Structures are given as C-alpha cells and as structure tokens.
Ligand binder design. Structure first.
Ligand SMILES: CS(=O)(=O)N1CCO[C@H](c2csc(-c3ccccc3NC(=O)c3ncc[nH]3)n2)C1
Length: 238
C-alpha cells in the first residue's frame, strides 16, 4: 500500500486491448524526474526480471458518484501481444519472415520469465502466447497473473504444460491448438494419449522439448530451468 501513484500524474488515452475486468488503455505517466512515460493502464510488485511484466503502480480514481475505479499501471509494449505479432508475421505489411532463431528466442525469454516465477513458487495459471507481451527491444515478457486448450489433464507442472502449448503457438505462428478438436472433446482426446502434432518444418529436437511438457505424469515433465537450458542449447546450435 505504498505502491500508489497520485491520480493527477496520469493522463488516459485510447483503448489498447480488452481485459478480464475492463479495458486496457494507453496513458502518459509524469515521473519523478519531471518527464512523461508512455504506460498501459488496466482498468506482482516484488517481481523484478526482464522477461516478467513489472508493476509501475496503482491509481484509484474517484467516480462522479464516489465508486472506486482502481487502475493498474504497466510498461507500454510497442508491439502488443505475441499471438497477434505472429499472425501479422504471415502477412506482407506486418513483420518479415521471422526466422527460426527469433522464434526460439521468444521461447527462451518466456522460459527465463517462468523460471524466475517458479523459483519464487508463483503459479501463472493462464500462460499462452496472447499473455506474452513484446517490448520495444523485441524481448518477450510474461503477463496476466480458463481456456480449456491450455489446461493440463489433472502446480507449476500445469504451467509447464501451458508453456509447451505456447511453444507450439509460436512454432505454428498463431494456429489455435488442436485443429479439428472441440473444447468439450479435449479431456477424452488427451486421456487417450493424443497430443499436439509436430508442426510442418519444425525440428525434431524442438518437438521433443515441447512434447516433454505434456507427459501424463506431471512428475515426468521437466522444470522451467531444465527447459530454459534445453532451448538455449538448441538456439546456440543453429
Ligand atoms: C497480457 S496483458 O494482461 O498484459 N493484456 C490483457 C488485455 O490486453 C492487453 C493488450 C492486448 S494488445 C495490447 C497492446 C497493443 C498495442 C500496444 C500496446 C499494448 N499493450 C500494452 O502495452 C500493455 N502493457 C501491459 C499490458 N498491456 N495490449 C494485454
């Protein structure tokens, strides 16, 4: 409760995306040095890591009737969510052919972020490419801490499952998981040992890593620190 920002230091602009509890808006935050910073405002503070969304602060606006309007202030992510970015990469006017190297680097960043959170025994519970945001340096961070296709059958090993699905989203550059399978069918599909199929031109080594995330027994799944190194090692071999 010393995380608060004076509401007068904040100017709210147009809507950036729509969130669980309300709109996410662009804003300008006047900082302690007198300068103004572009921010995102949703209408965590202990976390410090480059691949994890930092909290800048909180403002409570007073409505006209006096009902609280709490707002969460986050850094501005020029390139928006990773899911949308991948989709745009498949179009001429959006970003170029993203090579394999850049796709793995997105995976490594996310693994680094999740390694940090899992080490502090913090569960994400909603990890997906749409919840991974892109910084202006094009490094990815993790954000947004019940979409059936990211949930594991049965902990941090649930998060590991979702990260594997996220790796698949990245490898496919934005395909919805499990084409030709409905949401109500998912439990039976998985219970019979079926998993996300290997993407088209994607290396066997990469597919082994993502597959290890979906082992039936969560104790057979690797930790985030194991995954991170496996991904780093794969990247270095290209
Ligand atoms: C995953 S989430 O919980 O962060 N979330 C949930 C609601 O939709 C938001 C969203 C979607 S596309 C977008 C965006 C698009 C262009 C430029 C900047 C943008 N956002 C940010 O800079 C920003 N920073 C912190 C949160 N959002 N924002 C993101």
């Amino acid at each position: 409760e010393d995380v608060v920002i004076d509401r007068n230091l904040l100017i709210l602009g147009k809507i950036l995306g729509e969130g669980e509890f309300g709109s996410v808006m662009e804003g300008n935050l006047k900082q302690e040095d007198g300068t103004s910073l572009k921010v995102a405002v949703k209408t965590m503070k202990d976390f410090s890591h480059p691949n994890v969304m930092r909290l800048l602060g909180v403002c409570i606006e007073m409505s006209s009737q006096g009902i609280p309007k709490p707002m969460v202030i986050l850094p501005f992510m020029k390139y928006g969510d990773l899911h949308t970015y991948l989709l745009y990469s498949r179009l001429e006017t959006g970003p170029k052919h993203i090579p394999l190297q850049t796709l793995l680097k997105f995976m490594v960043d996310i693994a680094l972020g999740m390694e940090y959170l899992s080490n502090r025994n913090f569960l994400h519970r909603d990890l997906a490419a749409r919840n991974c945001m892109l910084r202006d340096d094009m490094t990815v961070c993790v954000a947004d801490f019940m979409p059936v296709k990211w949930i594991a059958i049965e902990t941090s090993k649930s998060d590991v499952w979702a990260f594997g699905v996220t790796m698949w989203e990245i490898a496919t550059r934005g395909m919805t998981p499990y084409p030709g399978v409905q949401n109500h069918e998912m439990y039976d599909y998985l219970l019979h040992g079926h998993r996300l199929k290997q993407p088209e031109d994607c290396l066997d080594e990469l597919y082994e890593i993502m597959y290890s995330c979906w082992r039936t027994d969560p104790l057979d799944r690797p930790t985030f620190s194991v995954l991170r190194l496996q991904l780093e090692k794969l990247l270095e071999s290209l």
